[PDB]
Each structure stands twice: as structure tokens, then as C-alpha cells.
Amino acid sequence: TDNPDGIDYKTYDYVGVWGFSPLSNTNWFAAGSSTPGGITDWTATMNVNFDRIDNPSITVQHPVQVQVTSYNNNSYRVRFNPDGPIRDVTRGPILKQQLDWIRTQELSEGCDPGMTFTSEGFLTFETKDLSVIIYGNFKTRVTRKSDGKVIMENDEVGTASSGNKCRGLMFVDRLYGNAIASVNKNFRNDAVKQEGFYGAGEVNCKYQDTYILERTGIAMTNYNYDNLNYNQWDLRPPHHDGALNPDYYIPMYYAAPWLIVNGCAGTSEQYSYGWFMDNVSQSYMNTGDTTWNSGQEDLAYMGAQYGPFDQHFVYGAGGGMECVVTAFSLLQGKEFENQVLNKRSVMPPKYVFGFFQGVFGTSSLLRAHMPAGENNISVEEIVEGYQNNNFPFEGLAVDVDMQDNLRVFTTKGEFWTANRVGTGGDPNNRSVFEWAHDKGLVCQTNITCFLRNDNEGQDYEVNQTLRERQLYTKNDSLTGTDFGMTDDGPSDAYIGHLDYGGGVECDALFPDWGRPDVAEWWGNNYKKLFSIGLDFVWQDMTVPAMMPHKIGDDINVKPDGNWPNADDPSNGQYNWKTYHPQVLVTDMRYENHGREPMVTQRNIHAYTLCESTRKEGIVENADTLTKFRRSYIISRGGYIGNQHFGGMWVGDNSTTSNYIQMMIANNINMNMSCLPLVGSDIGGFTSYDNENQRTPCTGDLMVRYVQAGCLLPWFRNHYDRWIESKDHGKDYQELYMYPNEMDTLRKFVEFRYRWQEVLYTAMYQNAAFGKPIIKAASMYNNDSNVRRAQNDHFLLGGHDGYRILCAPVVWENSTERELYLPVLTQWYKFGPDFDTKPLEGAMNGGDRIYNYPVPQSESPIFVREGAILPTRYTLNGENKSLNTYTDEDPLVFEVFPLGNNRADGMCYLDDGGVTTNAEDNGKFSVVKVAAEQDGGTETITFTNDCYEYVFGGPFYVRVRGAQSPSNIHVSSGAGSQDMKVSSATSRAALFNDGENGDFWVDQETDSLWLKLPNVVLPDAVITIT
């Protein structure tokens, strides 16, 4: 039954950060006083008296829960509901079952937060490193035990004569609105603390000409949006004139109400903590922005258009911002389901780390069946171009082009080898996906939840069963709004419009996700694609991203590009490029709880789509998958918690230097919002040349794009292609189309391929421990200079996740950059060339190099001392896809020069996702290695933490800076032997002809290679004298 809490919904339209202003006080309640309401488990209740700040005699009472969530990881939670009872969400990143599991574990270890009400009514409690006090009006001080330092405090506002009111807890009188807010003191301007705020999902922020990482001193909003180019005109500030650049006040595709605050950076007294307002209505994060009077320099807040109020403060276990990220990912963890592998996120197939190509505007599988049309291309041509030119190349992102007339889950004849649709498994009529398997590729295909509704009487089973089973969103509201209607019906359906431009368009119905039965119906449609050879999913238009529309207009008519605007507001008539926000949706937050207008829950839609694809598509129907039983999702939208469904790409970027800068910042920020497998379209998706949209990306920009993206988790070149029947886009963008740059393009893809295990093992570090793959420079501790370098330096890889430094050039036509090397370690220049020549001399960390040289053919990438990295090569020397590697393609442990006479490395091994036995049954291995120099003796030790996956071929150790040994001894469960010099005199010969127990003195790269049998991998001691 609709609106069960009896809310009066006051706001439906978007409200920019210019119109959200808690610090203006008027009509806001804040916390005035309280009394104790008891403690159950680790949850204290305070009965709080809220007073109206501009009239403190107007008062209301609500219960406020304060809960310790983790003692060891120093986290706690504050929640209340000004609109009804406090309720646990049944879907979302934070679930009570996980909180319960964490509390049960810590209790069994004797953790005691000692939560107590003092006799004065104040609440006090401790965690491992912290001590908290909450006074009568909710004024809060969080103190660090070791030094006494106050690391966080909430904000109070004075009144004329009625006492101080605490702005830590705020909500708008329900006579006037529905918003909520929470305000902290912000020490950004403090000379010593110099607080900086980080995180926030996909927000872009310009400073002068450059896009930057930090999110200090700015007003932001989470409001999932079809935001092509990151600067959609309807998102402009009131009365904005001239061009709109992407910038901090524009919402993006991923909803991330999450910041990590970092102060006293680089000193022994650094502190960090993360702040999450777990709300799925439009939310706001202001880190001290005066613009529009939205906030105040010395305060920070989070808020949202709708309740309930639920926020988490996360300080982490160890020192540094990375520890904040690992603790956040624990709160969202699946330890409560006893995951043997997928604890903090879900492991992809190895092939997800390959190089992919998407094209929007292919018109067939084969050249033989391609319809004639200016600039038409076949999938076949694309594969040829990469394969004939020896690119490492994983396969394809196959767009809505392959579908029958935009009906999702269909294909058309042109995308089969015999030019007609079959049901799969016919060797004389292969699907695009079957044909791609025979080329050694895998594919994703674009799926959205628009179910085409205008079918001209033709049969489309997906839409028909959605109808028949009453599973679509209805056209109901509390406002009597008329969302529109077509001749197709049904008469009570919400009907939207999908618009790809250039006439590529249709009417659609949508699944009402919170209804029981919907998630299962949806997952089952994927059988129709899995059984014809599809490997993984590309999840698009997820807001869901509807054609812009105004109430009263026909379903297929959009308003003037300029509307709405300040002089002519939406006034409850614009759809804000998704559902008209008054539509009653079955509640996605709370099961079996009724319907609410979509305005209350916008930012949960993408998350729920992905969830349903993951559980009911990929997992439930895993039997219908052909070549790889493990699969994955790469989604355009979502909410905090998406890492448990798959990874992300940052939608529709463009082809300029600024988009490279944004790609890098987005990747780092998304990693710290616990979404690690993320990327942006390499080369930019949209056209960029205003005098002729068809102009391709320049050679030099593509090189820089590829260089910047090559060690980022998701690596796909994808673009809008101009073709006769879809006349927007660029002519081409494929790497093989760049003859002058081909050699460079190719060698950075090879470089990535060699480090496939670095990426895959970082991914395991994330699934298991929650460590971000990509590290912000400021995650590197005891360094006072990283913060300056942080826009375009990042780190990754190796046993701790900090063994590789990247500082890619972020400007076209530029052959130098300012380089900063983190201090108290030594660095070695590396990159695609260094595989086949010696290292250069050590570079001293803490060095700043102005105008450091960077030819187009190079990019700045450094390997830290003490690193041992797993590295892969093809046995034959040809470039192949990841998914066609076997254990006979060499695994090689490269030992870089030692740090303090030591080096360390880790490697995760499984079958790559051929089966799901690694995550279902524990079938994986984790090998560690160490090297120690002690006088004239070097010892290299291999150990395992589990060895449940048997690596099937020989493996190597490549020691850099070593030459001829006097003797090498290997000890291992399988007894022990001395090694002998190989008869092989080259690397290809050692790989193919060399015997197990052979070593090779590689003078050309100044390396010693040792070849070892597979049985000594899990446990060995190697003594080099």
C-alpha cells in the first residue's frame, strides 16, 4: 500500500547545490538537548529534542541510535528517522547481517567498547584507537587515544538566548520539506592540519586549466544522470552563460556520498577518516564552499533531499587513507555468507583485464554480409586489423547494433555467419560470439532495461511476458501527473523513450525492480544470450537514462535544449532524463513495504539492476555459459556497494587532454569509494572537433590515452562511429588505424599483458582484503610532497600494492612533465622497452624533477626496489588473448634490485574463470616469494598461503643485476638438487628447449634466469652462491 509512512513529498525536481543550504538555518530543526534511552548490544539510543534554529521554542522529539560497528577498525554509526520508525534496509551496501557478523566476531575476541551513559546523560564509548563523547545536544568529539588529538568534531550554531544547537543532526521541518543534513567542523584552513577531502565517486573538478584529484572546498551532489561529456546543458547553474565545462557541481553516473578526510598529511600525527551518508535520494557533500552561499569555509556537511538519516564514520585500523578504504569495504563485506574468496568484491575472469574494442556503429559480423553504407564496418574487419597487426587483443564490446531493432536480448541475421538467427551450437551458422570464440576472443554486449514497447504488432517475448506477468512500472503517482501514453499500451504502464540520436530510437516499458518475481524474470532473459556464446555483460543507460521529456508532450518528443532553466523552471514537469520523479515505484530499499515516488530512491536504481543481473543472470544461469563459467558486469551506473556485482566504466567521455586528466582522477577516486575495477573509454567516446565531428583522435593524443590507461583496471577503446544510418561520431579510433604510432601503441598493450598477474593479484588483494588496486599518491605515508604530485601520480602492484609508480603525461603534444618520486625508497625507470635491456641506475625517492623528459614513445613508470613481480610471456612469442593463455605460457618471477637486502612478491593463481571453483569451493592458490641477500649468498624462498590450484607448467625466476652464479641449490618437498647452466643461449630457447633445473646468464638484459619445475612452486628454498 502506497506511501505507508504518510510522507508529504515536497520536492520532486533536481535541486542543484546552489539550492541546498543547511547553513541558512531557516525552517531547519537541529539537535537541542536529550536524555538517555538505553543500550542494547552495541547500540545506544538517545531521545533527542530537536529545536527549530530560527525559533527554538518549536521542538520535536526523535530517537537517535548511536552504534559501534567495529571496535578493531574504529568505526561507528549514527542513525534516525524523522518520518517514522527506524528501519533496516533489506538492500544496499550496509546490511545488518554483516554488522551482526562483525560484532559477533569482535565480541568473541573480548572487544569491549564500554558504551555507557554517564550520570549527566552524556554517551561515551571507545574503539581500539579512539574515544568518543557525545554531550546533551549531540555535540560530539572524537579523540585519538595515543596522542589525545581531537580528530573530528561536529558543528554547533548559537541562538539568541536558547543555547547552542548541534548541526551534526539536522532535518527540515516537515511543514516545509523533507531534507536532512549533518555538519562537521572543517579544518581545511588550519595552518597545521591543512585538511583535505577525497573520494566522491566520479566528480570532476577543474583548477585553472587542469583537472585535479582533491575535493576540498567544493559543493557536490550525487544524482545519477545520463551525463554525456560530463557537462550536460540541463545541469547548468542558474543563469549560466557560455560553455559549461565539466566541473565539481555537476552530478555524474555513480552515486558516492563518501569522503575521506586527511589531515596533518606526511607527519607522525596524520589522521584520516571516512564519512558515508548512506542515503539513495539526491545527496550532497560540501567541503567548505562559499559559492552560492552553499556552505562556509570552516564547515563541511553531507545531506540529502529525503530521509532517513544514516551515517557511518570510519577511521580504519592502521595509519593512512588506504586503511580507511579497507575498513569501509569490511562494513560492506560478505564474510557473513562465508565467502571463501569474494569477501569485499567479486573476482572477474582473468579476461576482464584484456584490451577490448567497442564500436557504436558496426552493421554486421562478416564483411560478406555487411550492408553497403558510407563508413560501414564489420566486426570481422576490426578483428582482422588487430590480429593481422599482432595486437594483444581480448575481444569486443558489441553494441545495440547487433540487436533486432533495439529489442534487448535479441540478435539479427547480419550478426551470424550464415546471415540468419539460429539457436546456437551450429558449426555452419555461428553467432558473433561463437565466431569470436574461434578467433580466441571473448565478448561483452550492451544490455539495458528498456524493453521495446512499439513493436508494430510483431512478437517480442521479453516485452510480452513483462506485460502478461504485471512486472512493469505502472503510471501511478500521488500528484495525478500524466506521464503520457501510446497506442501500444498497456493503459497503466509507465512508458518512456530511448534515444541514441540520429533516429536510433524507441518506446519502452521498464521493470519495477522492487516487485517480487522481477529479479528472477530479468536474470532468466540472459539465457537467450549466454546459450549463443555471450561471455560477459556491459550494463548501460542504467539511471534508467530516458530521453528528456516534459509532461503534456508526446512520448517521443523532447523539450527545447534550453529548457528547463532559471527563468523557466521545470516546476514538476521535467523527467530529468529518467523516470518522471513522481512515478510510484515498488520500494527498492525495503522489501514488502509498498510503493514510493522514485524521487526518494533515484540513486539505487542502477545498483538494483546490476544486483539482479549478477545474482539471477550470471550466477543462477551459470550452466548456460559456454566457454567461461565465471562472468562479469561492467556497468555505467550504480551506488556504493556495486563492487559486489562487477566493475564500472565512466560513461561517455570525449577525446581531449582534459578527459585523460579526468580518467586518471576518476580511477583513483572510484578506487577509494570501494569500486576498484573501473576505466574510461580509451581515446574518448564522443566526437571532439567542433568544425567537423568526424575527425578521429590524433595519433599523439591516442598514444597518451593508451599510455595513461594501460595499467588501469579496465582497458577498452570504445567510440561513437559515424555511419550513414547513424550520422554522429568519428570515422575511426582502432589502434591499428594509426600506422605512425602503431609500434608504440602495440608495445604498451604488450607491457600491460606481461603484467596481467600484477593486475589479477591486485584484484585478489581487493576481493579478499579490500585493498584498492589503484592508490592515490597521498596513500603513501610519511611523505609531505605526495599531496602536490597527487593529480597525475598513482601507485599499484606487488606484495603491498605500492611497488609501481605511474606519472603519465596528461597533455597532447608534450614531451616533458614534472616528476615526483616518493621518499625513503629507491626507484627504477621501467616501461615496455625494459623487458629486453638492463635497468638504469637507481633514482632516489623524494627527488623532484622539473621538465623530466618523456618522448611520445615513453611513459613515466617506475618499479620500486624490493619488488618481485609475476610476469607472463607467450611460449611462441606471438601476442595472444589472455583467455587463450595456458600454464605452458611462462610465469616468471622478476626480482628487481633489493631494498635493504630484501625483496618480496605475491601471486594469485586459478583457472582464470573457466569454472567458478575458486569462489565456490576454494580452488585457488596464493604463492609468496622473498629474496634476501646475506653476504655472498642470496636466498629466494617460495611459500604458499594455500595451494589448491595446481599450476601446470614450469616457472622462472629472473634476477635483475645478477650474472654468473658459482652454484645454485634448490630445496623443496620434492627433495633437493643443484641446478646446471643451460645449453640454451636465448630466452625463446630457454622457454622452448631448456630443461627444468637449467639456469641462463642473460648478459643483454643483465639478468639471471632459472627454470624450475611446476612441483617446486608451492614451497622452495633457492640458494645462489
Ligand SMILES: *[C@@H]1O[C@@](F)(CO)[C@@H](O)[C@H](O)[C@H]1O
Ligand atoms: C551506452 O550507449 C551506447 F549504446 C551508445 O552511445 C554505448 O556505445 C555507450 O558507450 C553507452 O554509454
